[PDB]
Structure 1
């Protein structure tokens, strides 16, 4: 019995949308605690029978790339921190240290001699060094897809289980720029019991602190019962550095950062330095410090207090270890021996803190509030909202989603077989997982690293894409060649991948042309892969060297095809126009591929001397004044010309779209007899403030509402075909394309902001929809959350991450925009949606990056636009914090994130070729996905194991019967199953041994993991 995620509004103590609606967000000077108030406490609260227990938790925040690359920081800082931690913890048995970033720890450990590896294991086993979270990185929470948050968590935790024999159950997220409930969702299903967060809006910290609601049971927005709840501690102050972690007054706390006395090149901004603790000052110093602790303790419900002790790349120098430890040891000895304080203070770990808090809870000392919602958009001070990084470095944001899919496909394709070690499959997959995992760092995908660090991430992701291609193409060859003929060279390229949308037309010529000719090669095999667990049709396209090409399946059945020219757009520096040129020797062929669930389908492209019976040719119309000719070689239809004009197009029995004379959508008509609904695309620009704070990689500080881009008289190209039609327009900084294939349109923007300094380009949709102040945005590609535009907050606070889509609706109509890349967006007026495309900023925004964003490069952004009637849909009530996609919008999102993969056979003849793989795979209900399929064992293992992550979304019921489907039992996808277990999502703990070796499907909004074991 599944929980209903639509109809029951959860009763929680704190619901963030409701809290936002009531809160005033005034930025008043609260005294030494600038964004709070002067905290008072009753000295009589703690006594002999009830002491304040204080855990001082040493830590070192190590960014895997930011101002330096991963490898530069490793060489210059992290290897020294870890080596000195090993020495100092070994030598000082009461000292403690927590570590978060497993990418660095693995880089260090694998360079240690055996003697030191053993010492390291002993300080972990004895509890002195404790891993927190245990992910490869500490991920961004705004732009990251949940599948990649899980990937990186699994990469780090798998490493820790194998080498350190530990699995963290407490998470530490001190630096991502705002926080998502996707984290507790994944963590709770991965064995965690507690989590800590820090970067939340200063007004939220004040509000929750006043009510002692900084520790809470964080449940999902739709969860009525509470089974998703994860205990969460929110830190109360402005930073995680020592000045902001001992108590409310940084001028005092800074005196207890013993690295700031001078010799380390650090000082206290508040102008009172630390002083070495001695017998003649320890009483006074302890009085000051305990007073700060007791104030901090007033904000929480138990008598157990967490005091983090650390900062960025701390605990490097031996002298720094000594100066912090010895001074703190003298404070503890004095405080703990002086009964009047009623304090017991010690170095601790994060787990120790949480264990003690829950001991207090069980003693009945405290009850904790329940909370749902998210913690975007973050502001650390004043109006400085961190919504810029929702868009910064959008080329790499898009590359993240391409690689996400490539990793899933490579792991799935190669999972079907066991591979000899010589094939290097595990090596290539581990490289690809680790590079993608690294980029989930909160300075990777966020676009907040220095230029040369961004280059490092890009090069690492390119290597990862090449690794995935290699694994995928070896796997396709194996899966589709008769076994007694299969003769692999594991270094050879049997297929190359063809990707139409990455890096994308005008980003890179990387697309191979299939070269056919009477005197060279009559035909070519191509293969499509479908990673989704249902039968899928999708139009696919290839470049070919003749327009006279026909398509057949591998029963030699003709397949209907359409040939179109290859159009590229050029900024003509001579005519000062942006206009398309057609190839006279290469052509695009398009046809519908039909591919089994988690399967492969082979087709053949064959040249002929003349127009093939089953291939049609698109017409082309170039709208511009002063046209010049556009020859297209042997292409059978001549290009037509016209002055700019409004136009209408309809493909299949799909919607009719109307366009303005500037080539931009103006209306959509869903059916023949239905109305033309206004839906108007517009491009605008935001600028930067000439006074006060400047936008940069993190902050979005616009100088007012956006202004329309001046379009001039742009060139519009219309291609009209039986299978696919398009309207493309060359605008300043954007080649904008609307593509129609018979359902919701696809939008592609080739965005090149060029040298336009201090500019952010936004794409806006204007409609009639009576949405008011409500809109919906997704969180990590997992869930859609209700947003409310608040006029009490500035424009940039009303921007939210759009990691995979957004929608507005009224009683009757919804408009959903799905994205193939995370970007920032909002609805700034009723009936509007907007999403930022790129931003180029000359200034640093004072958050430590030390540069602007001036390294833009052309990026192809992709979208689907779904207009729907929703008056018949069963939707949540007005007080529910969630929203849900329709079937068509979810499928559209899947078309963007997990398209069919296209392979071109590399050599002239494929001996032993087969037509299909996976025809007998179950075609699962449309809301179910196999998010992960990964073989967990190498070929020498007697018992093979394959792990699956299933996810079931929740789609709106809108009266479509859409019925008969097959049960998917992932445990029987591979033969000879001997056991099926439900596991944590990382595959690291068995939770249930499943009857009959059958893996049940999951409920709406649930995710489960299963491991099947196979005798081999």
Structure 2
């Protein structure tokens, strides 16, 4: 295994190093506004060395943005695809590339058989070529790598089944900045080449000057280069026709033949396209070839890529004709005039890359190596696209919830083969496709119109219900005696109970377990643990009595704590935000212990008085002018006091101190250690009153944030043996710090209300001597070193926080893990900050045509880990990566993949069993079974089950290793007949494995395996 910590890779371009050196001056470069006047030697190309030009027709089809997926399909995309089928069928030399398989599958299934056959023929013959082949072209900033892989697999599995093709070239022309997680996944999925477009205009200029726009993109920790993927970065401001023929858009616009008038389009540079004729083709070709030769100067080979397309292009039959016939006249002239020394033709993306690599192998060019990322993107001036790291945060959090529900549903149901009447495959396909659709770069990014966001939300709600149905049918089958199991595939044997989604204060969605002597004495509950190691976690349920005790199925008592159910209310009469307690529902909390990838059953039983093994939390409400707070049968009366500082400690965990406003002020790790200053603060950013306004995409603050005025907020302190917490009702945020014995959990119920033109940020202030360095993750996969640059504006120093961020000095580190992707930074030494929500009245001129005024309450969740790191073996000062400790990684897993909870619906569960998975291997902590998916329906004689195994890399800090069993996923199911290593999409077998054993993977590696069972 390669060492991902101690060996700094030697690359030609390292993006953090490049950023430190670049000046980012925004000077007017002439017609190429963000470049320079390109010059070329006319003698460079001659009869023995011609410029080969591939004009690649394309149509960017957003799966929802300003219309819903179905609205665009009916008004635009179905016409584009039907007319592409006809025009390619009738014009053999015409070509077209297609990226979004969600639309293609929607179209293809509605085609009659004769047309399906015609479509398969134009794909097989190379006229229509799929690029990437994912369900969507995903966002690369907020998306979790697991979901990027899920949507890639959904589109490519469809393409292999119906079109018999698997793309090896990727096309990503619209995500707002680019992540190295893409080449990571693509290179492990059979790809050979990729293309990107939205990178900072200063980066395009710098790389163009050095002819480094084509590069071998490797991961930041990869010393050898085995992860490398050839990448082409486009050079100009847009993928539209004016910015793809060459440097001067006033000239390129004249070659977009849809802009002459009858189509309702024109050239903003004021020179229209003119139909090509025999009287103007020489002058028109002179102009076009000059643009092409200038563009060719930015690259190393004699093969030039010229995309020809724009949003929802190639719809009308007349449009296909006007583009095709005019370009055919240009090619016939150009290719026949030896003096140009050019051979131009319509081509596909793969044809371009194949020709570039033929030139490379002929020794015509060598390509540079590169590592790093391409965030934060700016398309012009100071317009940095860091707003969408936070926009529509409710749905960003929903993405992570559904991510986990899909994983858990696929894993729980994979253990058995299911009759088609159970509709398992149907429900899982629906859930995978709705979550995959949301990975679109106008979905999770929060950059779609209001009604489109509603459509994504409805799709995701249906997907959550589908996952619940599959999960609960699976639990019932896995835990009922086989000869008793009698399923009704439409029945709800269990209800899922989720304490954090939509969340307390967001939706009252949880069911109360109703017990009583005159109705039901007890209730079975079941926990599932999707992770491949034994895990303990506190779990809670709502119950109708405080006198409840817990047992495991061997009837062993389990210690429990009961606390009230508190809800916060914005009292419009008293003008205060304060908590109300229920007098008939209570929370019972206990530690569940669950096998690796397994299930554990417990029983909740009511008694007439306090049970021996159940304790009750105390509650203290701090506020002036308190009123009573009765709690029914709850046995401890609520106490009141004036606001004051307080300190709490659960178990032998850290001791936390809080200000009189209910906000953390210090953490003391052990009884003898220092009270380390760690202060939470809420602030607000505004919008500029002159100049460009923030919107869904752009963050354009009117200076540093200002503190939110807190008033004298009401603070609630709950103290228990198993769980304690401090909650405070602040303007727009109910902030809660929860302690269970380790790093605290933070929950914010964020309701920005009607505060227009406001962004609310949560900041941590410490005295850690971090300087200008901080770390943020990329897609939940890796942590990358960031350097704050005071030569860039504040918004340029914001980066995606898809799952975590940290600052550190020689001795101390503070890591904040998140349960949702949000934007954040470290704007000063010792600080971390992360945006909670943003409400913007204005459109930001990127096509959306509205502000962001559809905010709704969202429950954001986090873990806050303060640790000593002086003994940790860390990368050297020049390494571009960072790595989590064991505690921080487990805290991230507690947020993203918690235990699932099931409440048995009926009164009696006949045939109930107490555990599943007790014999599953408990794998080393850095290994995860990211995906477990049965790949065959029940009719297949040979069943196949696919696994994606990911090993992260955790710092060595002196904690002895111990135990753990080797995990061989190929033997998790019985009767294994074959074990194969495959691409990550499961679509190609790469290795037949000896002894049917699937080896574990190296740190930072991801592999896929398929086991076959007789």
TM over 0.5: yes
- The Cα shift of 1:963 comes to 1.3
SS at match of 2:324: helix
- The Cα shift of 1:1013 comes to 0.3
- The Cα shift of 1:656 comes to 0.1
Question: Within 1, Cα distance between the matches of 2:199 and 2:262?
Answer: 34
- The Cα shift of 1:345 comes to 0.1
Task: Tell me whether 1:508 sits opposite 2:507 in the alignment.
Answer: yes
Question: Within 2, Cα distance between the matches of 1:393 and 1:867?
Answer: 29
- The Cα shift of 1:341 comes to 0.1
Partner of 2:536 in structure 1?
537
SS at match of 1:455: helix
**Can you list the C-alpha shifts for 1:555-575, whole angstroms capped at 9, x where unaligned?**
000000000000000000000
Question: Within 1, Cα distance between the matches of 2:386 and 2:482?
Answer: 54
- The Cα shift of 1:969 comes to 0.1
Question: Within 2, Cα distance between the matches of 1:699 and 1:914?
Answer: 54
Question: Within 2, Cα distance between the matches of 1:10 and 1:554?
Answer: 53
- The Cα shift of 1:198 comes to 0.1
SS at match of 1:64: coil
Question: Within 1, Cα distance between the matches of 2:990 and 2:480?
Answer: 38
- The Cα shift of 1:524 comes to 0.2
**Can you list the C-alpha shifts for 1:427-451, whole angstroms capped at 9, x where unaligned?**
0000000000000000000000000
Question: Within 2, Cα distance between the matches of 1:1008 and 1:371?
Answer: 23
- The Cα shift of 1:964 comes to 1.2
Question: Within 2, Cα distance between the matches of 1:908 and 1:706?
Answer: 55
SS at match of 2:106: helix
**Can you list the C-alpha shifts for 1:156-198, whole angstroms capped at 9, x where unaligned?**
0000000000000000000000000000000000000000000
Question: Within 1, Cα distance between the matches of 2:554 and 2:703?
Answer: 61
- The Cα shift of 1:293 comes to 0.1
Question: Within 1, Cα distance between the matches of 2:429 and 2:619?
Answer: 46
Question: Within 2, Cα distance between the matches of 1:414 and 1:37?
Answer: 58
- The Cα shift of 1:934 comes to 0.1
Point out where structure 2 has 5 or more consecutive residues left out of the alignment: none
Question: Within 1, Cα distance between the matches of 2:38 and 2:502?
Answer: 55
Question: Within 2, Cα distance between the matches of 1:344 and 1:670?
Answer: 70
SS at match of 1:379: coil
- The Cα shift of 1:962 comes to 2.7
SS at match of 1:110: helix
Question: Within 2, Cα distance between the matches of 1:4 and 1:625?
Answer: 58
Question: Within 1, Cα distance between the matches of 2:869 and 2:717?
Answer: 31
SS at match of 1:514: coil
Question: Within 2, Cα distance between the matches of 1:563 and 1:131?
Answer: 57
Question: Within 1, Cα distance between the matches of 2:667 and 2:961?
Answer: 25
- The Cα shift of 1:642 comes to 0.2
Aligned length: 1014
Calculate the TM-score normalised by the size of structure 2. Answer: 1.00
- The Cα shift of 1:975 comes to 0.2
**Can you list the C-alpha shifts for 1:744-778, whole angstroms capped at 9, x where unaligned?**
00000000000000000000000010000000000
Question: Within 2, Cα distance between the matches of 1:795 and 1:980?
Answer: 52
**Can you list the C-alpha shifts for 1:346-384, whole angstroms capped at 9, x where unaligned?**
000000000000000000000000000000000000000
Partner of 2:193 in structure 1?
194
Calculate the TM-score normalised by the size of structure 1. Answer: 1.00
- The Cα shift of 1:627 comes to 0.2
- The Cα shift of 1:738 comes to 0.1
Question: Within 2, Cα distance between the matches of 1:75 and 1:495?
Answer: 39
Question: Within 1, Cα distance between the matches of 2:769 and 2:844?
Answer: 37
Question: Within 2, Cα distance between the matches of 1:224 and 1:660?
Answer: 47
- The Cα shift of 1:912 comes to 0.2
Question: Within 2, Cα distance between the matches of 1:631 and 1:703?
Answer: 46
SS at match of 2:110: coil
Runs of 4+ in 1 over 3 A off after TM superposition: none
Partner of 1:129 in structure 2?
128
Partner of 2:43 in structure 1?
44
Question: Within 2, Cα distance between the matches of 1:177 and 1:963?
Answer: 44
Partner of 1:75 in structure 2?
74
Question: Within 2, Cα distance between the matches of 1:297 and 1:901?
Answer: 56
Question: Within 1, Cα distance between the matches of 2:249 and 2:830?
Answer: 46
**Can you list the C-alpha shifts for 1:916-964, whole angstroms capped at 9, x where unaligned?**
0000000000000000000000000000000000000000000000311
Question: Within 2, Cα distance between the matches of 1:134 and 1:789?
Answer: 36
- The Cα shift of 1:250 comes to 0.1
Partner of 1:86 in structure 2?
85
Point out where structure 1 has 5 or more consecutive residues left out of the alignment: none
Partner of 2:414 in structure 1?
415
**Can you list the C-alpha shifts for 1:127-169, whole angstroms capped at 9, x where unaligned?**
0000000000000000000000000000000000000000000
Partner of 2:812 in structure 1?
813
**Can you list the C-alpha shifts for 1:464-501, whole angstroms capped at 9, x where unaligned?**
00000000000000000000000000000000000000
**Can you list the C-alpha shifts for 1:643-688, whole angstroms capped at 9, x where unaligned?**
0000000000000000000000000000000000000000000000
Question: Within 2, Cα distance between the matches of 1:913 and 1:577?
Answer: 49
Question: Within 2, Cα distance between the matches of 1:144 and 1:294?
Answer: 38
- The Cα shift of 1:204 comes to 0.1
**Can you list the C-alpha shifts for 1:85-141, whole angstroms capped at 9, x where unaligned?**
000000000000000000000000000000000000000000000000000000000
**Can you list the C-alpha shifts for 1:329-356, whole angstroms capped at 9, x where unaligned?**
0000000000000000000000000000
Question: Within 2, Cα distance between the matches of 1:44 and 1:240?
Answer: 29
- The Cα shift of 1:256 comes to 0.1
- The Cα shift of 1:54 comes to 0.1
Question: Within 2, Cα distance between the matches of 1:608 and 1:491?
Answer: 34
**Can you list the C-alpha shifts for 1:205-237, whole angstroms capped at 9, x where unaligned?**
000000000000000000000000000000000
Partner of 1:231 in structure 2?
230
**Can you list the C-alpha shifts for 1:598-655, whole angstroms capped at 9, x where unaligned?**
0000000000000000000000000000000000000000000000000000000000
Question: Within 2, Cα distance between the matches of 1:357 and 1:717?
Answer: 65
Partner of 2:979 in structure 1?
980
Question: Within 2, Cα distance between the matches of 1:387 and 1:58?
Answer: 31
Partner of 1:163 in structure 2?
162
